[PDB]
Amino acid sequence: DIATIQKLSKDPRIVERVVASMAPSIYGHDYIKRALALALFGGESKNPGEKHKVRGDINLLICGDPGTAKSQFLKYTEKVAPRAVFTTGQGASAVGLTAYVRRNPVSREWTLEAGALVLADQGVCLIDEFDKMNDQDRTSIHEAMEQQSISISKAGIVTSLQARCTVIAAANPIGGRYDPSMTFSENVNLSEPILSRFDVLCVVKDEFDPMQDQQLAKFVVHSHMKHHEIPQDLLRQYIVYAKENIRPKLTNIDEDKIAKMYAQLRQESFATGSLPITVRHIESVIRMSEAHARMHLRENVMEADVSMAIRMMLESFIEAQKFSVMKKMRSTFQKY
Amino acid sequence: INLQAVKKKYKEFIRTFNEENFFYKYRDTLKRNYLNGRYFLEIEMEDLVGFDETLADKLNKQPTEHLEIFEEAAREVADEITAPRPEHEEHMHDIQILLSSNANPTNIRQLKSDCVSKLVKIAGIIVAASGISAKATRMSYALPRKCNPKCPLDPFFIMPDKCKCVDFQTLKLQELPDFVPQGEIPRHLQLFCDRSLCERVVPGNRVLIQGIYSIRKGVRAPYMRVVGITVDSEGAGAISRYSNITSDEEEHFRRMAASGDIYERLSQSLAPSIFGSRDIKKAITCMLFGGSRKRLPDGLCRRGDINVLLLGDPGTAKSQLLKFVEKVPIAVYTSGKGGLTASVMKDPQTRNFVMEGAMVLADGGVVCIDEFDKMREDDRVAIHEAMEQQTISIAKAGITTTLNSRCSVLAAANSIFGRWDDTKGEENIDFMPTILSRFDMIFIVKDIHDESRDITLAKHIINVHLSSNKSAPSEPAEGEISLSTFKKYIHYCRTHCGPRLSEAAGEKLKSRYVLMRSGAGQQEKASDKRITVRQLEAVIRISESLAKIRLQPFATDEHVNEALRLFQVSTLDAAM
Amino acid sequence: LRNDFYRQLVGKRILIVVNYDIDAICASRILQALFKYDHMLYTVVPIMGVTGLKRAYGEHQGDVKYVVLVNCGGCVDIVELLQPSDDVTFFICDSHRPLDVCNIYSDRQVCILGDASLEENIPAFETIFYDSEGEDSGAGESDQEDQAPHEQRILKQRARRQWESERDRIMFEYTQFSYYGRSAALMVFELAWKLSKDNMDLLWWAIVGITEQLLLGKIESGAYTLELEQIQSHVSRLTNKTNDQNTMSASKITFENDLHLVLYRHWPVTESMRYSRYSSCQLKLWTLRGEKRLHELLLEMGLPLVHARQTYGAMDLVLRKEFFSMVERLAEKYDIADIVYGTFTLSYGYRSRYAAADYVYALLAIMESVKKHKTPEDCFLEASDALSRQHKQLLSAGIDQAKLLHAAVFRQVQSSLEARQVHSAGSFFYYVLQEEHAFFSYPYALGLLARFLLRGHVATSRARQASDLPLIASCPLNASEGMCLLVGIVPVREDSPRNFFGKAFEQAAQKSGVALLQDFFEPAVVQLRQSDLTRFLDSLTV
Ligand SMILES: Nc1ncnc2c1ncn2[C@@H]1O[C@H](COP(=O)(O)OP(=O)(O)OP(=O)(O)O)[C@@H](O)[C@H]1O
Numbered sequence A: 001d002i003a004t005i006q007k008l009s010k011d012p013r014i015v016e017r018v019v020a021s022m023a024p025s026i027y028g029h030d031y032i033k034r035a036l037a038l039a040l041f042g043g044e045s046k047n048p049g050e051k052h053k054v055r056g057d058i059n060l061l062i063c064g065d066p067g068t069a070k071s072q073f074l075k076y077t078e079k080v081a082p083r084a085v086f087t088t089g090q091g092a093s094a095v096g097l098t099a100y101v102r103r104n105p106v107s108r109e110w111t112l113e114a115g116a117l118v119l120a121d122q123g124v125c126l127i128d129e130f131d132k133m134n135d136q137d138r139t140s141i142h143e144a145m146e147q148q149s150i151s152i153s154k155a156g157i158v159t160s161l162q163a164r165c166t167v168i169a170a171a172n173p174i175g176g177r178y179d180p181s182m183t184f185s186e187n188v189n190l191s192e193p194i195l196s197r198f199d200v201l202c203v204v205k206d207e208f209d210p211m212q213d214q215q216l217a218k219f220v221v222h223s224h225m226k227h228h229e230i231p232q233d234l235l236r237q238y239i240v241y242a243k244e245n246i247r248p249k250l251t252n253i254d255e256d257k258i259a260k261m262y263a264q265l266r267q268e269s270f271a272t273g274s275l276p277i278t279v280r281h282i283e284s285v286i287r288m289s290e291a292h293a294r295m296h297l298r299e300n301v302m303e304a305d306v307s308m309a310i311r312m313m314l315e316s317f318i319e320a321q322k323f324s325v326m327k328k329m330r331s332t333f334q335k336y
Numbered sequence B: 001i002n003l004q005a006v007k008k009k010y011k012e013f014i015r016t017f018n019e020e021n022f023f024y025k026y027r028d029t030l031k032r033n034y035l036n037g038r039y040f041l042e043i044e045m046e047d048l049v050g051f052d053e054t055l056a057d058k059l060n061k062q063p064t065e066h067l068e069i070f071e072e073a074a075r076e077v078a079d080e081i082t083a084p085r086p087e088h089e090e091h092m093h094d095i096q097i098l099l100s101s102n103a104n105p106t107n108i109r110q111l112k113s114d115c116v117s118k119l120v121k122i123a124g125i126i127v128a129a130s131g132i133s134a135k136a137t138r139m140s141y142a143l144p145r146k147c148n149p150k151c152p153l154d155p156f157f158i159m160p161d162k163c164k165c166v167d168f169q170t171l172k173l174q175e176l177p178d179f180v181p182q183g184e185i186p187r188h189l190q191l192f193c194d195r196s197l198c199e200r201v202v203p204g205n206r207v208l209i210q211g212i213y214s215i216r217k218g219v220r221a222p223y224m225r226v227v228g229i230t231v232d233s234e235g236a237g238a239i240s241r242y243s244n245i246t247s248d249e250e251e252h253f254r255r256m257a258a259s260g261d262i263y264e265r266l267s268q269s270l271a272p273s274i275f276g277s278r279d280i281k282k283a284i285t286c287m288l289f290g291g292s293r294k295r296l297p298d299g300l301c302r303r304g305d306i307n308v309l310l311l312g313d314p315g316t317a318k319s320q321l322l323k324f325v326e327k328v329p330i331a332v333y334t335s336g337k338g339g340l341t342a343s344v345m346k347d348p349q350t351r352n353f354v355m356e357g358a359m360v361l362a363d364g365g366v367v368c369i370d371e372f373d374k375m376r377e378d379d380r381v382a383i384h385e386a387m388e389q390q391t392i393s394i395a396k397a398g399i400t401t402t403l404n405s406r407c408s409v410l411a412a413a414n415s416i417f418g419r420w421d422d423t424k425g426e427e428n429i430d431f432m433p434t435i436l437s438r439f440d441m442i443f444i445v446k447d448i449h450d451e452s453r454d455i456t457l458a459k460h461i462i463n464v465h466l467s468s469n470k471s472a473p474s475e476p477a478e479g480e481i482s483l484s485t486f487k488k489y490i491h492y493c494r495t496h497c498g499p500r501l502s503e504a505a506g507e508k509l510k511s512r513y514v515l516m517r518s519g520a521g522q523q524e525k526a527s528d529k530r531i532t533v534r535q536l537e538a539v540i541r542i543s544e545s546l547a548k549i550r551l552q553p554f555a556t557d558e559h560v561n562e563a564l565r566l567f568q569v570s571t572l573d574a575a576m
Numbered sequence C: 001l002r003n004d005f006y007r008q009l010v011g012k013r014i015l016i017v018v019n020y021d022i023d024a025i026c027a028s029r030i031l032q033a034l035f036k037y038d039h040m041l042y043t044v045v046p047i048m049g050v051t052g053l054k055r056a057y058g059e060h061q062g063d064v065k066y067v068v069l070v071n072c073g074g075c076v077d078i079v080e081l082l083q084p085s086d087d088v089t090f091f092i093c094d095s096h097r098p099l100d101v102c103n104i105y106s107d108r109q110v111c112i113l114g115d116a117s118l119e120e121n122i123p124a125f126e127t128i129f130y131d132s133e134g135e136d137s138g139a140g141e142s143d144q145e146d147q148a149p150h151e152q153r154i155l156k157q158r159a160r161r162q163w164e165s166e167r168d169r170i171m172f173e174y175t176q177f178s179y180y181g182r183s184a185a186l187m188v189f190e191l192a193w194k195l196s197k198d199n200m201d202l203l204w205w206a207i208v209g210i211t212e213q214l215l216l217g218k219i220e221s222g223a224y225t226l227e228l229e230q231i232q233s234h235v236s237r238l239t240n241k242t243n244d245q246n247t248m249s250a251s252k253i254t255f256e257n258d259l260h261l262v263l264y265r266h267w268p269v270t271e272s273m274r275y276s277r278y279s280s281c282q283l284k285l286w287t288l289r290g291e292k293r294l295h296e297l298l299l300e301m302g303l304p305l306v307h308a309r310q311t312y313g314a315m316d317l318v319l320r321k322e323f324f325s326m327v328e329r330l331a332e333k334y335d336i337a338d339i340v341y342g343t344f345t346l347s348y349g350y351r352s353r354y355a356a357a358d359y360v361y362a363l364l365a366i367m368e369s370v371k372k373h374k375t376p377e378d379c380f381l382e383a384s385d386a387l388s389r390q391h392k393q394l395l396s397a398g399i400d401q402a403k404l405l406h407a408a409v410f411r412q413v414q415s416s417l418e419a420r421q422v423h424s425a426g427s428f429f430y431y432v433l434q435e436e437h438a439f440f441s442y443p444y445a446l447g448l449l450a451r452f453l454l455r456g457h458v459a460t461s462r463a464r465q466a467s468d469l470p471l472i473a474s475c476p477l478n479a480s481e482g483m484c485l486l487v488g489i490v491p492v493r494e495d496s497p498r499n500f501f502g503k504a505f506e507q508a509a510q511k512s513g514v515a516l517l518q519d520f521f522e523p524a525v526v527q528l529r530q531s532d533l534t535r536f537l538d539s540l541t542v
């Protein structure tokens, strides 16, 4: 009962078995949970010669609306994933609890630390209430995201240290509930030179249909009828096997087409909600493809997962644009 | 046994080392050390296998004794050759040995009880170390009871006219940043050094080390010393003060110098993975080289180095560039959150006010920071001062030791709302202009759109970001190669030449700066609403740097048209 | 036999050495030294290809008399190739034996080194140029109209009947299979041994010559377990010192029974157990399991793990002396049998004790197909300036370069295999490749590429139905604008049954024929256009 991996893991339909044990919690919301399932699955250094450490952990968010069951999405991650941390909004000033301290054996060694990313590397950070923190701490957290490193002073020491881990947040916006499909930069005061560091977006937009209200109500009432296809028993181990041992790659396949799609992205998106159109989120696409083939243990990949990634981004980036929600739709039925 | 070693083996070992070509000895090396007062000698650890097959496997286990049988053999083999006749051994003298190897480096995390009183090899990094007190060998530990009418119970008077004296320094070691500090912080260790190896290692360097893990007094204590240190070759891991460079190296260097396709070669040197951004890059490399620190009969120790600026929208590879400038002679990096105070703490031993002192640590190195922006003003004023006079002052308690340090500086930034400020007027900085004035470079970054550039920056990055590509095809380009060369090459070029200008450069530069200031004042008057000595005294440093590059002392203003057309970028940037 | 001809050799000459090889340099540096002995000036030559040879003779288009070529001969009826050859002294000494006899006869301008237990082609010329049909020899070569001292024209019928019924053996020659034969300069050692030359370094050079293609998997030795008598009989019997050998320089060379795993001496172990084929494939390490079975063997040897990532030279003593004293006996029972072979070793002095074959794996790595456009010939001039005792700063660089290549090799094999790039494509197996490396540009490294994939896949994913099938491979050259190199290679474990592909690729050339080249004296090779192989592959199936 250890090769249960290769008892099922090579069948085709089990791509969507990510979701049947992602969080069997809440009727709708498949897309965002599959996306989290991806971003929990990935990791690679791919360090080239001498330059730097590239990236293998990725920014997420769901700045939606106060009500959508999203808090609860994240606790499954904490109780399921290997390594994580305890925090809400309103941490320190990001200076940290007794961080800067010069070194003597007076005051009984005078404890040292710099925050918490140092304390969970190759793990994840749980945060909520992004829009409800002292700006000068959410300032300070703005180095780990891509550079994955810290660097300090203001003691008798100038030691340095890496901060390699993963971010996830599910906060709330300004303005009560949520605008309509009206733009994002108008909808919450998260500035330009950060949300670019953020890549993969999602939004829990809600509006009123009676049918799905009946459906999910039935689902909830049944969810409180617990009286007296995977379990959680395994995907823990599947992700450990996938994140530790296998170390996939890429090959020359069709990688010119990403250029045309990024070009369509930036040209059709100039001044509407078009500030967060940068190069890490097109790091992310090919990297997510590698994560998909990691979810297969394929170790290489064909056009399938690349088209899936490009599909997801068509989806989300259409979601966070106007009531005319079909601009890229009409522009993209030829790829779809 | 103590003597069968010295009786023949070590004593004849040095005598017996023989390859024709009549070099392969340690005898001539010993004598040519002796003549010049050095008093040391170096060996490997896998030459003894070329003499025998046992002694080495005894050298590891009982080193502390063997490494004195060596000293006795050394001097008794060397004082025979001191003798020209029996009339010029004025008196004998003691020596210290060095041994080296190429076996394999280790890590601090395996230094445990079994690796004790035993030889090793490691590789770490340094923070700081002590001063130079003392220690000696003999004079005229337990000093027992007997005396030598009575003279009672240990009356021993040291005769320190008749004592001796060797050195003592207490070096230090921290680990490397890639051996599981991930869920931790880095530990470190203190050390020991003996006779001729103080002022051999300044802190802030990469080391190889040959040492031994031995104690002083069951919870008893650790320490280590040098058993014949050597150093690192992370490109040029330790090439920071001394010279084992050879005429071959000087030859290759200066043969590179006269090669008049080196600078445009070097504008493509830093990024074997990034496209474009070349005029941004033509003076990130000159910043290393530095100009001239010309003091005069009056006070004017005028500003030697240069300083850098950049602010721009994200998405143009700021961070990697600054990390690379840290990578390629000596430097450090923080960014924000750190100081305005210096370090007047107190060792709890003796209760005094010592001065631990880290712009100190770039006194020939440099420094780079990002986020002058997102670190507020309580720590900007000490650095307001340092980078214009370099006389870092101190006046806190009863000490006024205004020490100094020569450092340059590099600045990244982040402006609010992207080019929102950069299109309109006065939101370039939000804070003040006198650290925007007190710098040299003025280089803004934008990320403007164009489909050709889009598609190119698309495929240019993919071949970079595909499967650790650059094994074969990077160095096969023309001359964009070998940062290690750049390290050693700089530590030559800065430390030789004393350049300064010609005649013809002066008038052209004066007229040019005149037109610059006049254009600024006309922009003041042509808008009915609103030029330092620093700008001249800095742009002169780019001529300084260029003449530093080609190794010509005297440089021209036609040579410097490139520099002033670089400063043109600054001028037409702060155009408004 | 030139105990008689060598006394002809005093006047001027040209010493050519055809396309690059370790037989080449080994057999030729010795002759350089010989010919600077009796005071003659001479010429050593690089060949990059037969065109380089024809222009060389064009560049040496004089009447130079004692002209020599070594390790070639099968290119043309070399009288036909070579017009100014009128009575000039030619010399072959080549081990690529299956040559036509048009080159052998005409006993003025060739030297028949015909000596073998194979009297297989005795009448082989008595009908080709001696008889003819559709053309006074008094044969079919002459008139055929009942004029040559069942019907008047059955003359031709019997003529072609004999002709073709013995083309059963002519098609056996040069049209079924090719090989090499005997040594490159061991004959030359025994030649010079009559002249009282006790050059121990010459013995080392010829040992290099043999242990290239003593690789009983690559090219056959045959004499091997007979040369354990022969070469020792050359050297061991004549001892200049029975009591005085505790000397520094060039102590009289020795022989021991050791292995052919790569670079056991100069590197750590657990990476050097990983790059050979015979140790790797028979333990299957590119899969995770192989590390475990390797580890459970390391248990039985009980070497330390930490030690197994230290250089063998860098280990402590007793393990590094007892290593092979153990491995030879408790490896026979755990899937691997046949790495132990017969080779030599010696030290110059105190530095370290070089391994008798560890030069060749640096030499093969001195083929630097660099974009400077000069470096092959400079690589030759470096190589033959390497094998001495003198030049040794460069042999270490060679070893370094060699090992980093050998650990780049695997890096592609895992990449290619578990994506299942092993295209069957019919009667044989087939491989294709996309872009260029400086590693595997030229074809020596390319055969080395093929001969790890091959064992890996064909041994481990099949029944015993298809374990005996041959090999091909692409190899692109972004160097020359697109030519799509290819090489032919044999099936498994058939030492004497060597290449069909001396010509066999030429089947499709006969059918359609597209821009094909055979520029190398090497037969087991071809050169093409950038992508004009696909239909040529559809032809080249059968
Ligand atoms: N569609 C739903 N499916 C399942 N549970 C739900 C759903 N909607 C609400 N709940 C329940 O309501 C509770 C509130 O969770 P929810 O995440 O909606 O609050 P929240 O939106 O995170 O609030 P805040 O964002 O201010 O923290 C949860 O226990 C959740 O189980």
Ligand SMILES: Nc1ncnc2c1ncn2[C@@H]1O[C@H](COP(=O)(O)OP(=O)(O)OP(=O)(O)O)[C@@H](O)[C@H]1O
Pocket: A054, A146, A147, A193, A194, A279, A280, B273, B274, B275, B312, B313, B314, B315, B316, B317, B318, B319, B320, B413, B414, B461
């Ligand atoms: N011009 C470029 N060419 C190639 N790659 C680039 C370029 N610009 C950015 N990159 C990629 O993006 C990363 C650089 O982003 P960088 O860390 O400089 O952003 P940043 O300047 O730190 O943003 P901010 O200033 O807002 O923090 C690099 O890892 C690199 O792979």
